[PDB]
Amino acid sequence: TLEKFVDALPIPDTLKPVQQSKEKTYYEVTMEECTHQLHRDLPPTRLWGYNGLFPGPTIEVKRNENVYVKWMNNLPSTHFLPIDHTIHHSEEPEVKTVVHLHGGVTPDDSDGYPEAWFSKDFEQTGPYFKREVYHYPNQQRGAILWYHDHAMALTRLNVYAGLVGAYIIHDPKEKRLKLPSDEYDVPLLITDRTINEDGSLFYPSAPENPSPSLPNPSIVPAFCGETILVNGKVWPYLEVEPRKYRFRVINASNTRTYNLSLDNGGDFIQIGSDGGLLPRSVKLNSFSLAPAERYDIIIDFTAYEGESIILANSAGCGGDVNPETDANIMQFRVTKPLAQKDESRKPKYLASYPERIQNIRTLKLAGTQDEYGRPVLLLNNKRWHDPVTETPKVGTTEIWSIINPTRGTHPIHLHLVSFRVLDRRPFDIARYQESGELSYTGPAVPPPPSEKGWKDTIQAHAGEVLRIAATFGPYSGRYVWCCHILEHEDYDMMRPMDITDP
Numbered sequence: 129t130l131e132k133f134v135d136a137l138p139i140p141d142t143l144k145p146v147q148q149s150k151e152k153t154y155y156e157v158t159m160e161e162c163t164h165q166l167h168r169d170l171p172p173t174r175l176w177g178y179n180g181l182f183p184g185p186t187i188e189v190k191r192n193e194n195v196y197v198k199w200m201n202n203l204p205s206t207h208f209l210p211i212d213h214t215i216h217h218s219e220e221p222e223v224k225t226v227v228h229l230h231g232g233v234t235p236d237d238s239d240g241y242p243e244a245w246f247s248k249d250f251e252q253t254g255p256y257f258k259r260e261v262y263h264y265p266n267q268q269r270g271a272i273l274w275y276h277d278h279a280m281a282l283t284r285l286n287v288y289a290g291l292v293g294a295y296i297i298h299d300p301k302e303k304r305l306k307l308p309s310d311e312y313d314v315p316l317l318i319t320d321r322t323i324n325e326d327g328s329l330f331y332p333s334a335p336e337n338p339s340p341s342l343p344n345p346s347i348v349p350a351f352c353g354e355t356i357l358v359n360g361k362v363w364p365y366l367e368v369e370p371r372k373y374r375f376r377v378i379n380a381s382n383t384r385t386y387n388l389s390l391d392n393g394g395d396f397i398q399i400g401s402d403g404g405l406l407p408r409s410v411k412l413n414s415f416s417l418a419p420a421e422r423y424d425i426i427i428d429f430t431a432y433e434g435e436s437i438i439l440a441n442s443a444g445c446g447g448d449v450n451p452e453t454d455a456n457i458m459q460f461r462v463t464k465p466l467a468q469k470d471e472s473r474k475p476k477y478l479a480s481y482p483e484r485i486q487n488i489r490t491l492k493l494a495g496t497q498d499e500y501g502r503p504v505l506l507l508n509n510k511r512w513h514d515p516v517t518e519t520p521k522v523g524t525t526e527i528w529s530i531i532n533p534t535r536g537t538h539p540i541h542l543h544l545v546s547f548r549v550l551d552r553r554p555f556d557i558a559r560y561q562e563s564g565e566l567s568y569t570g571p572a573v574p575p576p577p578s579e580k581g582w583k584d585t586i587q588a589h590a591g592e593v594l595r596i597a598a599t600f601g602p603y604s605g606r607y608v609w610c611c612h613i614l615e616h617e618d619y620d621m622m623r624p625m626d627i628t629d630p
């Protein structure tokens with residue numbers, strides 16, 4: 129149905145501070161119901177948005193800028209998407225919110241803990257709530273971060289509703305690299321959605337072929353949207369100048385993984401991963417992008433003046449990709465006149481490369497089944513509410529060995545830290561399931577170049593052990609690690625992570 133490439137790509141405006149001095153920058157962001165048209169041929173869609181915008185405003189900060197954001201809830205008391213009351217037990221408000229700055233090196237009470245939620249005007253607050261005004265010291269590498277809702281049992285719904293936005297940390301020490309900047313540095317927040325004829329968002333209230341005993345609504349274990357949006361617009365086009373652009377590619381989708389290419393066979397240059405600039409730039413013809421991953425890339429349109437180039441997708445969601453729909457992301461049109469000379473660069477040398485092993489943690493990804501027969505996905509056999517087990521000591525380095533005996537990939541995220549990827553190694557799934565015994569079926573494989581820098585969300589593929597290494601700090605406190613497939617996260621593939629200080 130919806131005609132591709134008829135609406136221009138929105139570029140969210142950069143948020144202006146309410147107050148700013150040399151010592152402190154203070155922002156206010158209020159979650160509001162709002163209405164926006166997502167495609168030329170759709171009626172406007174009721175959404176929830178940060179400052180009533182979808183996506184939310186892009187926040188731009190400097191490394192070490194002392195930033196505060198008062199994230200406020202001015203949402204209705206009843207949700208518009210289907211709440212499953214059976215997935216969590218503790219009366220509480222139906223609509224609960226909390227903002228997680230994904231990738232932030234953030235004090236624990238500003239990290240957006242799932243039980244630090246709040247209702248409208250903070251009238252009711254969860255048992256881990258401490259503060260209204262979140263503090264982001266930004267003492268971390270320049271990078272693409274993003275912010276999104278993280279409320280207990282509601283994350284998949286609140287994010288789907290529209291509560292996502294970009295947050296960019298600029299390190300002045302990188303300015304000398306002359307990477308494309310300003311108008312030539314564009315975030316691309318990719319979100320798949322299913323939209324009804326009347327313009328309303330569709331989110332399933334049950335899996336296919338439910339029983340009458342099955343809760344209604346019921347959580348589903350995965351969501352694949354019919355349409356692809358970039359920056360809140362269905363299959364948009366972007367007019368570009370014939371020169372180099374930097375794009376901050378963010379997968380803000382609930383479940384869907386992308387595998388991106390350019391339909392002319394042209395290359396990307398990757399310059400950065402979740403945790404900042406790679407040590408060296410990486411020429412790529414394609415890349416996978418699972419939920420919450422970011423690729424910081426340069427696309428050089430210099431030789432392509434007048435051309436239309438599709439950012440294409442080869443990964444299916446619930447089936448093979450459809451050439452007419454989800455195989456398309458957006459269309460670049462190289463038809464904008466040059467505003468000035470391209471004085472940007474695509475340097476090879478970007479940053480220095482990524483220490484004692486304190487602990488090695490072996491962690492399994494697996495599910496159980498509930499009383500209604502639905503899968504409940506768990507991190508190392510535990511529910512969210514079980515006593516904490518992942519308890520690294522502050523200032524120490526650990527290796528985490530993530531065993532995935534399930535049928536699909538899980539994008540695992542650690543809060544607070546970024547980590548290095550050591551290797552992946554295939555193992556005998558049936559043996560592991562039958563006995564707990566890990567028997568490798570092949571040699572360990574080091575990460576691709578794209579994963580030789582710093583990561584915070586990482587694909588743990590089926591039938592493999594993935595090893596990562598992280599140094600836990602600089603802060604101690606109560607954080608989280610989770611699978612970022614939101615349908616998994618909410619039931620119940622998330623755990624507390626305590627970074628302890630003796």
Ligand SMILES: [Cu+2]
Nearest residue numbers: 228230276420
């Ligand atoms: Cu996240």
Ligand SMILES: [Cu+2]
Nearest residue numbers: 538611613616
């Ligand atoms: Cu998962």
